[PDB]
Amino acid sequence: ADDATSQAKAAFDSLTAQATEMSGYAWALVVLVVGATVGIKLFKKFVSRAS
Amino acid sequence: ADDATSQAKAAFDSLTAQATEMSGYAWALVVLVVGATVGIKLFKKFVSRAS
């Protein structure tokens, strides 16, 4: 049934938009972990600069 | 009687054409059950693909 594939198609479009919403939180979580590594690694840069 | 076998022959041809009409609905009913299994089993394929 091609009417059957219309029901499955609309639900797969809602599930892939759910994947872009959760993946958007994955870009923002690695935003805050990379903010920790840039701050901390500049602290170690000052360690070697005064050494 | 061979005239007797002419009456029985024509009624057996109508009964076997009735068997092809009902069997045609059996091909179409298993059309819609196999449409359910192809749709649903591609849903389970997406389950393992994102896993």
Swiss-Prot record, chains A, B:
Compartments it resides in: Virion; Host membrane
Membrane-side (Periplasmic) residue stretches: 1-22
GO cellular component, as recorded: helical viral capsid; host cell membrane; membrane
Main location: virion
The keyword Transmembrane helix belongs to this UniProt entry's keyword annotation: yes
Record-annotated membrane-spanning stretches: 23-43
Membrane topology listed for this record: Single-pass type I membrane protein
Keyword Transmembrane among record annotations: yes
Superkingdom of this protein's organism: Viruses
Keywords for the protein's UniProt record, in alphabetical order: Capsid protein, Helical capsid protein, Host membrane, Membrane, Signal, Transmembrane, Transmembrane helix, Virion
Sequence ranges on the Cytoplasmic membrane side: 44-51
Known role: Self assembles to form a helical capsid wrapping up the viral genomic DNA. The capsid displays a filamentous structure with a length of 760-1950 nm and a width of 6-8 nm. The virion assembly and budding take place at the host inner membrane.
Family listed: Belongs to the inovirus capsid protein family.
Subunit structure comment from the entry: Homomultimerizes. There are several thousands of this protein in the phage capsid.
Protein name (database record): Capsid protein G8P
Species of provenance: Escherichia phage If1 (Bacteriophage If1)
The encoding gene: VIII
Residues of the full protein shown: 24 to 74 of 74
